[PDB]
């Protein structure tokens, strides 16, 4: 049912009515989106071409619209020459509107035909014509060809130079033709000639209209040709300084904004001096906001480090004082830009005679905060965003200010409206997440604030409870008191949405407070109106129950270890039964089931290990026969090697097969895998061959990023276990009981730090899938493709990538590794044709050519695997795992020859 | 002149093929000594002296290609050498 849509819509195309043909033409883009493979694309584009050739000039506009929309599918066209000839057969017509439409189609088609000479001749001929629609379409197509072709660029450089300063072709047409000079960056002397022509134009037509158009053109030429961008930044400083007009100044602002966003390393010191000095003596306020917005975007990059470079007192520098009087300005936006600049100076380079500004910086934030808290307007909300981002960055860069930072924030958490409680709770959440030592310093104060929310408004209430209980969970780095649980619970019994309690429960499951997760999951379990959502909530409840059982541990007590581990396994198994029941074909929950299954396997590896440590106290030294490994305990810990190493491999396999998670979920998977490697190394350093260890951890054990509290406690446990392993290296007997005690304490230390269900367990932001439509003949089901067993099978695998939303949010596909293998299904098994190829997609397409050698006699099983390679370099093992069946026939002449031989 | 051309679109199995240098180390003889040297259905017919038979098959063993040492020599052997020497008897023999 792939070409059937093509025959249906082209049956629509063979009508004699304009309406049905137009309907089919405008229905083509949906069909393009549904099947993107180039057979259908090429066929439908040729049909669009020979519908375009004969038409009543309104079908032509519709096909132009479809070509404009479906630009990313244009490179998939195979029979390019017939397509372009059918389109080009309308230039020689005498209807000027049809000609203009066809030049617009050529301009749309520019990507696939950069160096077609007759197209350039048609553009040049129609460009100096007298019909206005033809002229405008010619300028459009000249702009679109000039971005790709170079000989067209130089010839049209001469032509457009002549027609701009030809003193005919009135000012509207000149405004239309200056972007032709914008697209004109291909060669050095071409760029220089365009630069001279633009300078002559801007000094020759000193208007409001032409100066704006010419300056935007001139800066796009500068940002395209990176050979004299500082000259244009310089020229923009004289245009922003010495020009009385206002709109020219506004373009100078947006121009310097674009140039600072693009190439900030070219900004020289005197350029920043000129920008700051022009920002001082301006009488207006919107212009002030614009220049200091440009300086704020310039302050977030390495331009400041070039500005504050050794070989004057930086207190006397223009930028810092300008930041001061615009941080203490009346308008809110200019204050936000100034406090961004001051925060960025503080976070950047650490010269001594800047440190006093630190004090100014922090006071600035709270001053701005008490201006923008009590306003309730979207501009004030954006000012809140900017201020709180500056608060986070300021506390991040200089931690010794940070404590003062957080306490000031709590003051404005006492008196502000319901839209200001949120995002301040978020700033507190971020600061107390990465830097935890301050979080407890809130504790109880949030309690009374939370009490006030018992009698607050209703419109923004639910999000506000979500934010407050989230920052409560973040701040409670050690645990939560029973009274804290009681007050949170009674408040959300007082009023709740039902989805708010779900968000609170999943926040608690994220942080590690699994008892309140239990209680809210009970509340959800009584609730809710579907099958698999009920099973999902039951599974989450059981996981919270097992994790409270894991929190109920005591150090140096192995009996409680076995008991609580058994309770955790039984609650996890009720939970994994619920998860298996909750799985749906529409939403095939795969990360959750694998994560829970490997968690179960980790705790059972721990259980077998702890009872194996108990086996030395539960068996003989060996036997009467043994009198360099003696006893069954050696074989048992070798099995522990096998289980833990396989478990680490399975954690790695779960890491590689996701590709759609965030940094935190991946880092948590890394924590679990590192726990498996930790226990494996700890055992193979104590009992199984101490002799060839000889390492004593010759790597760094400090100075970590510590992006979460769970990460920090994991790393502390890791370092403590490695310290115990280094100390107890080669002093004692190979079996020992300090060795078993070391394993016991290691297992207790790993199970004390609870767990963290991360973001990918609950919500999925990025969804990427691959198609891989195999076409040797695609078969049907059990029917195999017949091969003649004297030639190879040209597989011809072709693929396309499907993105759920926001194309690539976290990681971007750079190249894709297709792997193919065979298997003799008759019963190594045909490993002789394992093949690998790297693909770089153009827009979404994958096109490779695979030859498979089927040689022996039988039915073979082709499997195709995908492997995404990202921009950094990590390979990711996703893919549909496509399998196809082949039967190997023989030539009867060859069969008779083999029988005779 | 070569396989590169008219031989590709005129080749007919079975055939009698006369190939390049009989030393079995360079020419088109190496290509047909491969490919076809997989079945006992075919044979290679060595016909020219002053190249060792078993030594020519030495890089090609192990091998299932049928081989017959059938050397054709036209040079005179020792009986007519004796006839020549008793016919035109010299003063010295080198």
CSV table of C-alpha atoms in Angstrom, one decimal, chain A residues 227-603:
chain,number,residue,atom,x,y,z
A,227,UNK,CA,38.1,37.9,6.3
A,228,UNK,CA,37.3,41.5,7.5
A,229,UNK,CA,34.5,41.2,10.1
A,230,UNK,CA,36.4,43.5,12.4
A,231,UNK,CA,36.3,46.2,9.7
A,232,UNK,CA,32.5,45.9,9.6
A,233,UNK,CA,32.3,45.9,13.5
A,234,UNK,CA,34.3,49.1,13.3
A,235,UNK,CA,32.0,50.6,10.7
A,236,UNK,CA,29.0,49.7,12.8
A,237,UNK,CA,30.5,51.5,15.7
A,238,UNK,CA,30.7,54.7,13.7
A,239,UNK,CA,27.2,54.2,12.4
A,240,UNK,CA,25.9,53.6,15.9
A,241,UNK,CA,27.8,56.6,17.2
A,242,UNK,CA,27.8,59.2,14.5
A,243,UNK,CA,24.3,59.0,13.0
A,244,UNK,CA,21.2,61.0,14.1
A,245,UNK,CA,18.6,58.5,12.8
A,246,UNK,CA,17.1,56.0,15.1
A,247,UNK,CA,16.2,53.0,13.0
A,248,UNK,CA,19.7,52.9,11.7
A,249,UNK,CA,20.8,52.7,15.3
A,250,UNK,CA,18.4,49.9,15.9
A,251,UNK,CA,19.8,47.9,12.9
A,252,UNK,CA,23.3,48.6,14.4
A,253,UNK,CA,22.1,47.0,17.6
A,254,UNK,CA,20.6,43.9,15.9
A,255,UNK,CA,23.6,43.7,13.6
A,256,UNK,CA,26.1,43.8,16.5
A,257,UNK,CA,23.9,41.2,18.2
A,258,UNK,CA,24.2,38.9,15.2
A,259,UNK,CA,27.9,39.4,14.9
A,260,UNK,CA,28.6,38.9,18.6
A,261,UNK,CA,26.5,35.7,18.4
A,262,UNK,CA,28.4,34.5,15.4
A,263,UNK,CA,32.1,35.4,15.7
A,264,UNK,CA,32.8,36.9,19.2
A,265,UNK,CA,36.6,36.1,19.1
A,266,UNK,CA,37.1,38.9,16.5
A,267,UNK,CA,35.9,41.6,18.9
A,268,UNK,CA,38.9,43.7,19.8
A,269,UNK,CA,39.4,45.7,23.0
A,270,UNK,CA,38.8,49.1,21.4
A,271,UNK,CA,35.7,47.8,19.8
A,272,UNK,CA,34.3,47.0,23.3
A,273,UNK,CA,35.5,50.4,24.5
A,274,UNK,CA,33.6,52.1,21.6
A,275,UNK,CA,30.5,50.1,22.3
A,276,UNK,CA,30.5,50.9,26.0
A,277,UNK,CA,31.3,54.6,25.4
A,278,UNK,CA,28.4,54.8,22.9
A,279,UNK,CA,26.3,53.1,25.5
A,280,UNK,CA,27.1,55.8,28.1
A,281,UNK,CA,26.1,59.0,26.3
A,282,UNK,CA,22.9,57.9,24.8
A,283,UNK,CA,19.8,59.9,25.8
A,284,UNK,CA,17.3,57.2,25.0
A,285,UNK,CA,16.3,54.0,26.9
A,286,UNK,CA,15.4,51.5,24.2
A,287,UNK,CA,18.8,52.2,22.6
A,288,UNK,CA,20.4,51.7,26.0
A,289,UNK,CA,18.7,48.3,26.4
A,290,UNK,CA,19.8,47.3,22.9
A,291,UNK,CA,23.5,48.1,23.3
A,292,UNK,CA,23.6,46.5,26.8
A,293,UNK,CA,21.8,43.5,25.4
A,294,UNK,CA,24.6,43.2,22.8
A,295,UNK,CA,27.2,43.6,25.6
A,296,UNK,CA,25.3,41.0,27.7
A,297,UNK,CA,25.5,38.4,24.8
A,298,UNK,CA,29.1,39.4,24.4
A,299,UNK,CA,29.7,38.8,28.1
A,300,UNK,CA,28.8,35.1,28.0
A,301,UNK,CA,31.7,34.2,25.8
A,302,UNK,CA,35.5,34.5,25.6
A,303,UNK,CA,35.4,38.1,24.6
A,304,UNK,CA,35.6,39.2,28.2
A,305,UNK,CA,38.8,37.2,28.7
A,306,UNK,CA,40.3,39.0,25.6
A,307,UNK,CA,39.0,42.3,27.1
A,308,UNK,CA,40.5,41.7,30.5
A,309,UNK,CA,43.9,40.6,29.2
A,310,UNK,CA,47.3,41.6,30.7
A,311,UNK,CA,49.2,44.0,28.4
A,312,UNK,CA,45.2,50.2,33.5
A,313,UNK,CA,43.2,49.3,36.6
A,314,UNK,CA,40.1,47.3,35.6
A,315,UNK,CA,38.0,49.3,38.1
A,316,UNK,CA,38.6,52.3,35.8
A,317,UNK,CA,37.6,50.2,32.7
A,318,UNK,CA,34.4,51.4,30.9
A,319,UNK,CA,32.6,48.1,30.9
A,320,UNK,CA,32.4,47.5,34.7
A,321,UNK,CA,31.2,51.0,35.5
A,322,UNK,CA,28.7,50.9,32.7
A,323,UNK,CA,27.5,47.6,34.1
A,324,UNK,CA,27.1,49.4,37.5
A,325,UNK,CA,24.9,52.3,36.4
A,326,UNK,CA,22.9,50.1,34.2
A,327,UNK,CA,22.5,47.5,37.1
A,328,UNK,CA,21.2,50.4,39.2
A,329,UNK,CA,18.9,51.7,36.5
A,330,UNK,CA,15.1,52.3,36.8
A,331,UNK,CA,14.0,50.1,33.9
A,332,UNK,CA,13.7,46.4,34.6
A,333,UNK,CA,15.1,45.0,31.4
A,334,UNK,CA,18.3,47.2,31.4
A,335,UNK,CA,18.8,46.1,35.0
A,336,UNK,CA,18.5,42.5,34.0
A,337,UNK,CA,21.1,43.0,31.2
A,338,UNK,CA,23.4,44.9,33.6
A,339,UNK,CA,23.2,42.2,36.3
A,340,UNK,CA,23.9,39.6,33.6
A,341,UNK,CA,27.0,41.6,32.6
A,342,UNK,CA,28.1,41.9,36.3
A,343,UNK,CA,27.5,38.2,37.0
A,344,UNK,CA,29.4,37.2,33.8
A,345,UNK,CA,32.4,39.4,34.9
A,346,UNK,CA,32.3,37.7,38.3
A,347,UNK,CA,32.1,34.1,37.0
A,348,UNK,CA,34.8,34.9,34.4
A,349,UNK,CA,38.6,35.6,34.9
A,350,UNK,CA,39.9,35.7,38.5
A,351,UNK,CA,42.1,38.9,38.8
A,352,UNK,CA,42.3,40.1,42.3
A,353,UNK,CA,41.2,43.8,41.8
A,354,UNK,CA,37.8,42.7,40.6
A,355,UNK,CA,36.7,40.8,43.8
A,356,UNK,CA,34.9,43.9,45.3
A,357,UNK,CA,32.5,43.8,42.4
A,358,UNK,CA,31.4,40.3,43.8
A,359,UNK,CA,29.8,42.1,46.7
A,360,UNK,CA,28.1,44.6,44.3
A,361,UNK,CA,27.0,41.6,42.2
A,362,UNK,CA,25.1,39.8,44.9
A,363,UNK,CA,23.4,42.9,46.2
A,364,UNK,CA,22.3,43.7,42.7
A,365,UNK,CA,20.5,40.5,42.3
A,366,UNK,CA,18.4,40.9,45.4
A,367,UNK,CA,17.7,44.5,44.6
A,368,UNK,CA,16.5,43.5,41.1
A,369,UNK,CA,14.5,40.6,42.7
A,370,UNK,CA,12.6,42.9,45.0
A,371,UNK,CA,11.8,45.0,42.0
A,372,UNK,CA,10.5,42.2,39.9
A,373,UNK,CA,8.7,40.0,42.4
A,374,UNK,CA,5.5,42.1,43.0
A,375,UNK,CA,4.6,42.9,39.5
A,376,UNK,CA,2.9,39.9,37.7
A,377,UNK,CA,3.5,40.8,34.1
A,378,UNK,CA,5.2,38.8,31.3
A,379,UNK,CA,8.1,41.3,31.1
A,380,UNK,CA,8.6,41.0,34.8
A,381,UNK,CA,8.4,37.2,34.5
A,382,UNK,CA,11.2,37.3,31.9
A,383,UNK,CA,13.1,39.5,34.2
A,384,UNK,CA,12.6,36.8,36.9
A,385,UNK,CA,14.0,34.2,34.4
A,386,UNK,CA,17.1,36.3,33.7
A,387,UNK,CA,17.7,37.2,37.3
A,388,UNK,CA,17.4,33.6,38.6
A,389,UNK,CA,19.6,32.3,35.8
A,390,UNK,CA,22.2,34.9,36.9
A,391,UNK,CA,21.7,33.8,40.5
A,392,UNK,CA,22.4,30.2,39.6
A,393,UNK,CA,25.5,31.1,37.5
A,394,UNK,CA,26.8,33.4,40.2
A,395,UNK,CA,26.4,30.8,42.9
A,396,UNK,CA,28.0,28.2,40.6
A,397,UNK,CA,31.1,30.2,39.6
A,398,UNK,CA,32.0,31.5,43.1
A,399,UNK,CA,30.9,29.1,45.8
A,400,UNK,CA,32.1,31.3,48.7
A,401,UNK,CA,29.4,33.9,47.8
A,402,UNK,CA,26.8,31.1,47.4
A,403,UNK,CA,25.7,30.8,51.0
A,404,UNK,CA,24.8,34.5,51.1
A,405,UNK,CA,23.1,34.0,47.7
A,406,UNK,CA,20.8,31.3,49.0
A,407,UNK,CA,19.8,33.1,52.2
A,408,UNK,CA,18.8,36.2,50.3
A,409,UNK,CA,16.6,34.1,48.1
A,410,UNK,CA,14.7,32.7,51.1
A,411,UNK,CA,13.9,36.2,52.1
A,412,UNK,CA,12.1,36.9,48.9
A,413,UNK,CA,10.4,33.5,49.3
A,414,UNK,CA,8.5,34.9,52.2
A,415,UNK,CA,6.7,37.7,50.4
A,416,UNK,CA,5.8,37.2,46.7
A,417,UNK,CA,2.9,36.1,44.6
A,418,UNK,CA,2.0,32.6,43.4
A,419,UNK,CA,3.9,33.2,40.1
A,420,UNK,CA,7.1,34.1,41.9
A,421,UNK,CA,7.2,31.2,44.3
A,422,UNK,CA,7.7,29.1,41.2
A,423,UNK,CA,11.1,29.5,39.5
A,424,UNK,CA,12.5,30.7,42.8
A,425,UNK,CA,11.8,27.2,44.1
A,426,UNK,CA,13.4,26.0,40.8
A,427,UNK,CA,16.5,28.1,41.4
A,428,UNK,CA,16.7,26.8,45.0
A,429,UNK,CA,16.3,23.3,43.6
A,430,UNK,CA,19.2,23.6,41.2
A,431,UNK,CA,21.5,25.2,43.7
A,432,UNK,CA,20.7,22.7,46.5
A,433,UNK,CA,21.0,19.9,43.9
A,434,UNK,CA,24.5,20.3,42.8
A,435,UNK,CA,25.8,22.0,46.0
A,436,UNK,CA,24.1,20.2,48.9
A,437,UNK,CA,25.6,21.7,52.1
A,438,UNK,CA,23.3,24.7,52.0
A,439,UNK,CA,20.1,22.8,51.5
A,440,UNK,CA,19.5,21.7,55.1
A,441,UNK,CA,20.0,25.4,56.1
A,442,UNK,CA,16.5,26.0,54.7
A,443,UNK,CA,14.8,22.9,56.2
A,444,UNK,CA,12.0,24.0,58.6
A,445,UNK,CA,11.7,27.5,57.1
A,446,UNK,CA,10.1,26.0,54.0
A,447,UNK,CA,7.7,24.2,56.3
A,448,UNK,CA,6.1,27.4,57.5
A,449,UNK,CA,6.1,28.7,53.9
A,450,UNK,CA,4.4,25.5,52.9
A,451,UNK,CA,1.9,26.1,55.7
A,452,UNK,CA,1.0,29.5,54.2
A,453,UNK,CA,0.1,27.7,50.9
A,454,UNK,CA,-2.7,26.0,52.9
A,455,UNK,CA,-4.6,29.2,52.4
A,456,UNK,CA,-3.3,30.5,49.1
A,457,UNK,CA,-5.0,31.0,45.7
A,458,UNK,CA,-6.1,28.2,43.4
A,459,UNK,CA,-5.1,29.1,39.8
A,460,UNK,CA,-1.3,28.6,40.1
A,461,UNK,CA,-1.6,26.4,43.2
A,462,UNK,CA,-0.8,22.9,41.9
A,463,UNK,CA,2.5,23.9,40.2
A,464,UNK,CA,3.5,25.8,43.3
A,465,UNK,CA,3.0,22.8,45.6
A,466,UNK,CA,5.0,20.7,43.0
A,467,UNK,CA,7.8,23.2,43.1
A,468,UNK,CA,7.9,23.5,46.9
A,469,UNK,CA,7.8,19.7,47.6
A,470,UNK,CA,10.5,19.2,44.9
A,471,UNK,CA,12.8,21.7,46.6
A,472,UNK,CA,11.9,19.9,49.9
A,473,UNK,CA,13.0,16.6,48.5
A,474,UNK,CA,16.2,18.2,47.1
A,475,UNK,CA,17.1,20.0,50.3
A,476,UNK,CA,16.6,16.8,52.4
A,477,UNK,CA,20.0,15.4,51.6
A,478,UNK,CA,20.1,13.0,54.5
A,479,UNK,CA,16.4,12.0,55.2
A,480,UNK,CA,13.0,13.4,56.1
A,481,UNK,CA,11.6,13.4,59.6
A,482,UNK,CA,8.3,11.8,60.5
A,483,UNK,CA,6.7,15.1,61.3
A,484,UNK,CA,7.8,16.5,57.9
A,485,UNK,CA,6.1,13.5,56.2
A,486,UNK,CA,3.0,14.2,58.4
A,487,UNK,CA,2.8,17.9,57.5
A,488,UNK,CA,3.3,17.3,53.7
A,489,UNK,CA,0.8,14.5,53.8
A,490,UNK,CA,-1.9,16.5,55.7
A,491,UNK,CA,-1.5,19.5,53.4
A,492,UNK,CA,-2.0,17.5,50.3
A,493,UNK,CA,-5.0,15.7,51.9
A,494,UNK,CA,-6.4,19.1,52.5
A,495,UNK,CA,-6.3,20.0,48.7
A,496,UNK,CA,-4.7,18.2,45.7
A,497,UNK,CA,-5.4,17.7,42.0
A,498,UNK,CA,-4.5,14.0,41.7
A,499,UNK,CA,-1.9,14.7,39.1
A,500,UNK,CA,0.0,16.9,41.6
A,501,UNK,CA,0.4,14.0,44.0
A,502,UNK,CA,1.7,11.9,41.1
A,503,UNK,CA,4.4,14.6,40.4
A,504,UNK,CA,5.3,14.7,44.1
A,505,UNK,CA,5.5,10.9,44.2
A,506,UNK,CA,7.8,10.7,41.2
A,507,UNK,CA,9.9,13.5,42.6
A,508,UNK,CA,10.3,11.5,45.8
A,509,UNK,CA,11.2,8.4,43.8
A,510,UNK,CA,13.8,10.5,41.9
A,511,UNK,CA,15.5,11.9,45.0
A,512,UNK,CA,15.3,8.8,47.2
A,513,UNK,CA,12.6,9.4,49.7
A,514,UNK,CA,10.7,6.1,48.9
A,515,UNK,CA,8.4,6.0,52.0
A,516,UNK,CA,6.4,9.1,50.9
A,517,UNK,CA,6.6,7.5,47.4
A,518,UNK,CA,4.9,4.4,48.9
A,519,UNK,CA,2.1,6.4,50.5
A,520,UNK,CA,1.4,8.6,47.5
A,521,UNK,CA,1.5,5.5,45.3
A,522,UNK,CA,-1.1,3.9,47.5
A,523,UNK,CA,-3.2,7.0,47.0
A,524,UNK,CA,-2.7,6.7,43.2
A,525,UNK,CA,-3.5,2.9,43.4
A,526,UNK,CA,-7.0,3.5,44.8
A,527,UNK,CA,-7.5,6.2,42.1
A,528,UNK,CA,-7.2,6.1,38.3
A,529,UNK,CA,-9.4,4.8,35.4
A,530,UNK,CA,-7.5,2.4,33.1
A,531,UNK,CA,-5.8,-1.0,33.1
A,532,UNK,CA,-2.2,-0.4,32.3
A,533,UNK,CA,-1.9,2.9,34.2
A,534,UNK,CA,-3.2,1.0,37.3
A,535,UNK,CA,-0.6,-1.7,36.7
A,536,UNK,CA,2.1,0.9,36.2
A,537,UNK,CA,1.2,2.6,39.5
A,538,UNK,CA,1.1,-0.8,41.3
A,539,UNK,CA,4.6,-1.5,40.0
A,540,UNK,CA,5.9,1.8,41.2
A,541,UNK,CA,4.3,1.2,44.6
A,542,UNK,CA,6.1,-2.2,44.8
A,543,UNK,CA,9.4,-0.6,43.8
A,544,UNK,CA,9.0,2.0,46.5
A,545,UNK,CA,8.2,-0.7,49.1
A,546,UNK,CA,11.4,-2.7,48.2
A,547,UNK,CA,13.4,0.4,48.4
A,548,UNK,CA,12.2,1.2,51.9
A,549,UNK,CA,13.1,-2.3,52.8
A,550,UNK,CA,16.6,-1.5,51.4
A,551,UNK,CA,16.7,1.6,53.5
A,552,UNK,CA,16.1,-0.4,56.6
A,553,UNK,CA,19.7,-1.7,56.9
A,554,UNK,CA,22.3,-1.7,59.8
A,555,UNK,CA,26.0,-1.7,59.4
A,556,UNK,CA,28.0,-4.8,60.5
A,557,UNK,CA,24.9,-7.0,60.6
A,558,UNK,CA,24.6,-9.6,58.0
A,559,UNK,CA,21.4,-11.2,59.3
A,560,UNK,CA,19.5,-8.0,58.7
A,561,UNK,CA,21.2,-7.8,55.3
A,562,UNK,CA,19.8,-11.2,54.2
A,563,UNK,CA,16.4,-10.5,55.6
A,564,UNK,CA,16.0,-7.0,54.0
A,565,UNK,CA,17.5,-8.2,50.7
A,566,UNK,CA,14.9,-11.0,50.6
A,567,UNK,CA,12.1,-8.5,51.3
A,568,UNK,CA,13.4,-6.2,48.6
A,569,UNK,CA,13.5,-9.1,46.0
A,570,UNK,CA,10.0,-10.2,46.7
A,571,UNK,CA,8.6,-6.6,46.5
A,572,UNK,CA,10.6,-6.1,43.2
A,573,UNK,CA,9.2,-9.3,41.9
A,574,UNK,CA,5.6,-8.2,42.5
A,575,UNK,CA,6.6,-5.0,40.9
A,576,UNK,CA,8.2,-6.6,37.8
A,577,UNK,CA,5.1,-8.8,37.4
A,578,UNK,CA,3.0,-5.5,37.5
A,579,UNK,CA,5.4,-3.9,35.0
A,580,UNK,CA,5.1,-6.9,32.6
A,581,UNK,CA,1.3,-6.7,32.9
A,582,UNK,CA,1.5,-2.9,32.3
A,583,UNK,CA,3.3,-3.3,29.0
A,584,UNK,CA,1.3,-2.2,25.9
A,585,UNK,CA,1.9,-2.6,22.1
A,586,UNK,CA,1.3,1.2,21.7
A,587,UNK,CA,3.8,2.1,24.5
A,588,UNK,CA,6.2,-0.8,24.8
A,589,UNK,CA,7.9,0.1,28.1
A,590,UNK,CA,11.4,-1.3,27.5
A,591,UNK,CA,13.7,0.9,29.6
A,592,UNK,CA,11.6,0.4,32.7
A,593,UNK,CA,11.4,-3.4,32.5
A,594,UNK,CA,15.2,-3.8,31.7
A,595,UNK,CA,16.2,-1.4,34.5
A,596,UNK,CA,14.0,-3.1,37.0
A,597,UNK,CA,15.2,-6.6,35.8
A,598,UNK,CA,18.9,-5.6,36.1
A,599,UNK,CA,18.2,-4.1,39.5
A,600,UNK,CA,16.7,-7.4,40.6
A,601,UNK,CA,19.8,-9.2,39.2
A,602,UNK,CA,22.1,-6.8,41.0
A,603,UNK,CA,20.4,-7.5,44.3
